[PDB]
Amino acid sequence: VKYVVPSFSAGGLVQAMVTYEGDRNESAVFVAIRNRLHVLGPDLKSVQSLATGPAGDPGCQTCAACGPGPHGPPGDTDTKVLVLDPALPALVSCGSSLQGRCFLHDLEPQGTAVHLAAPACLFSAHHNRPDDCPDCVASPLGTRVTVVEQGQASYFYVASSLDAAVAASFSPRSVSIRRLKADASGFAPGFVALSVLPKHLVSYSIEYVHSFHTGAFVYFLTVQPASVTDDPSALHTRLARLSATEPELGDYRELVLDCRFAPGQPYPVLQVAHSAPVGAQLATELSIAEGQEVLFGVFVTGKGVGPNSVVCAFPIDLLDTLIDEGVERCCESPVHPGLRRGLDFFQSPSFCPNPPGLEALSPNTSCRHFPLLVSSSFSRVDLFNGLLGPVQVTALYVTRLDNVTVAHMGTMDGRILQVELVRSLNYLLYVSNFSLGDSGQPVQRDVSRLGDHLLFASGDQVFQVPIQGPGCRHFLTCGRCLRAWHFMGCGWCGNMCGQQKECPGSWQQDHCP
Ligand SMILES: *[C@@H]1O[C@H](CO)[C@@H](O[C@@H]2O[C@H](CO)[C@@H](O[C@@H]3O[C@H](CO)[C@@H](O)[C@H](O[C@@H]4O[C@H](CO)[C@@H](O)[C@H](O)[C@@H]4O)[C@@H]3O)[C@H](O)[C@H]2NC(C)=O)[C@H](O)[C@H]1NC(C)=O
């Protein structure tokens, strides 16, 4: 386990981290702690900082941008969302405080780094009501945001966990699609939204693990109760799919995802997820085409035999097909009976093809025009055949590198494992292990890329790790050098391990003296 020194100490537990790489070779890391946002340059040294709380503090620089104070309740600001809007380009931050409002921070050139212009408060006074708040975006219970450009407008696809206390007034809703106004004063009213019905808010809640935009859709991954009339600890994982091309939630779709250890045993609870295009080797094994986008998920049982963690692969094109087939099953032809529409937490029960709460489909109305849950689940089996054993995976980032696909897995004890993503039987193919300093705190869920390094947080620090694993020069004998994976371009120079270019006449990968 190669020791990795921290690159940045945040002064507090890192709540959120996202990166930016611009067109002009400018880049940045945005790192959020309670009450503070940090901007780092490409060398991961700080260029700027901003006070994001506490609310009703004169020193709160985001709060101050909402105009003459104060704004309440007073309280600490925990950062729930950090997202880039590349169209501007601008960072958007949204906090636990101040009704979940967001702030807009224009990116300005600063050498190879970036600096943020003074914050715009995305909350207009005369525009938000306790019963209707287009600018109430984030929930202290947690929020995922994906930004999609449609023509010359930026839309914010927002999922926010709810309960009764958060929804009472100025509620953020469950799923929404909000247009950011060009004058930076807020989001456009009239946005569309689904949320957990007040009657269900009492006992039913939804966690949002991940969100991403690929092809014509925005996808959210969720953990929630298997059923609305069921123990709120019988949890499972769902994929929610929304149109990325129209700002509408009529055809919102969910699909239950089922990963199992099957040498089988279900691992119903999603811990962390990442999607990425796969290399040719894994593509062949999954029967898809090289470079196809695959959604990878780390699952746990959520509570004897079996690994602590499994990793399942769900190719995006197959998920979309399963969903399309689910729609036809609900809405086509003669529908088979007893097929539920579902999403009872968002809408009234009904059976396909009827609209929520109804027993007939009227001729002026379309079955597909209402949200539905796909009737059968998508089941996959652990790519790693239980080989992660007792390891508790807390973070995941997948990178394609020619034919090879690598998983970079963060652990509960502060390690990174890099493993080739293949269907494994008897052993895992480790590229490299890292330790992140030696607090051994958990690796935080959210992993960012910067150039050819990945950034991971644990505790109050950010670390960088090479995507390709350690340089060839770290292999000190010929056998070791030649044991290195293909993709690294390591070859023995005679007394030295290097790339071809360091010993053009002797570089070889073939055998040892
Ligand atoms: C990166 O990180 C991984 C830590 O999770 C680590 O993986 C573990 O490595 C250890 C040491 O090799 C593995 O322990 C072996 O497991 C199998 C069990 O069948 C055995 O081959 C093996 O042989 C022996 O076990 C004997 C007991 O019968 C023991 O006395 C000997 O000492 C001998 O080791 C070990 O039991 C462990 O299973 C691996 N775990 C997992 C979850 O994969 C990697 O080594 C490390 N990789 C790199 C490239 O750095």
- Give me the DSSP letters along 185-202: S-BPTT-EEE---HHHHT
Q: Ligand 1 centroid to 443 CA: how many Å?
A: 22
30 vs 199: CA distance, rounded Å: 39
- Check residue 17 and give left, alpha or beta (phi > 0: left; psi -120 to 50: alpha): beta
- What is d(CA 222, CA 227) in angstroms, rounded to the nearest whole number? 14
How far is 378 from 386, CA to CA, in rounded Å?
19
According to DSSP, the residues that pair with 409 across neighbouring strands are 396, 417
**Residue 444 per-residue DSSP state:** P
The minimum-distance atom of ligand 1 relative to the CA of 431 is 49
Contact 104, 146 (CB under 8 A): no
Q: What are phi and psi of 214, to 5 degrees?
A: -145, 135
For this PDB entry, the determination method is X-ray
**Ligand 1 mean position to 477 CA, how many Å?**
22
CA distance linking residue 354 with residue 370, whole number of Å: 9
How many other CB atoms sit within 10 Å of the CB of residue 40?
Answer: 25
Resolution (Å) of this entry: 1.9
Per the document, the length of the chain is: 513
Q: Is the peptide bond before 54 cis (omega within 30 degrees of 0)?
A: yes
How many Å lie between the centroid of ligand 1 and the Cα of residue 480?
18
CATH topology of domain 468-513: ligand-binding face of the semaphorins, domain 2 (3.30.1680)
Of 337, 342, 458, residue with least CA distance to 395: 458
**All residues at 6 or more sequence positions from 29 whose CB lies less than 8 Å from its CB, including other chains:** 8, 17, 18, 19, 38, 39, 40, 44, 448, 450, 455, 462
Between CA 276 and CA 112 the distance in angstroms is 27
Residue nearest to atom 2 of ligand 1 (CA): 433
First to last CA, the chain: 28
Structure tokens at 110: 């600063």
Which residues, 6+ apart, have CB-to-CB distance to 44 below 8 Å? 7, 8, 29, 455, 462, 464
**Do 220 and 243 meet the contact criterion of CB atoms below 8 Å apart?**
no
- The CATH class, in words, for 1-467 is mainly beta
Ligand 1 interacting residues, C-beta cut-off 6 A: 387-389, 391, 417, 428, 430, 433
Q: How many angstroms separate the CA atoms of 95 and 11, rounded?
A: 18
CB of 228 closer than 8 Å to CB of 345: yes
Q: Is 72 exposed, middle or buried (0-12, 13-18, 19+ CB in 10 A)?
A: exposed
- The domain locations on the chain are 1-467, 468-513
Residue 405 tokens, joined: 């696909």
Rg (CA), the chain: 24
Q: How far is the CA of 389 from the centre of ligand 1 (A)?
A: 11
Say how far apart CA 193 and CA 213 lie, in whole Å: 18
Q: Evaluate whether 166 touches 139 at the Cβ level (below 8 Å).
A: yes
- Residue 239: helix, strand or coil by DSSP? strand
Cα(345)–Cα(8) distance, integer angstroms: 42
Residue 164: which H helix or E strand, with range? helix 164-167
- Residues 474 and 418: their CA atoms lie apart, in Å, by 16
Beta strands, E only, 141-234: 143-150, 153-160, 175-179, 192-194, 207-214, 217-225
Ligand 1 atom at minimal distance to the Cα of residue 432? 49
